[PDB]
Amino acid sequence: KKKNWFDITNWLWYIKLFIMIVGGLVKK
Structure with missing residues (x-):
């Protein structure tokens, strides 16, 4: 489990979703 935590794909x-929740705030 913890050894595979480096897989950013998880x-x-x-x-x-960070771009979806912000919508217009994506630029910050």
Whole structure:
């Protein structure tokens, strides 16, 4: 489990969604 935690693909969804939740605030 913890040895595979470096696979950014697990938490990549929250990164892609960060642009969706902000919409217009994406530029900061």
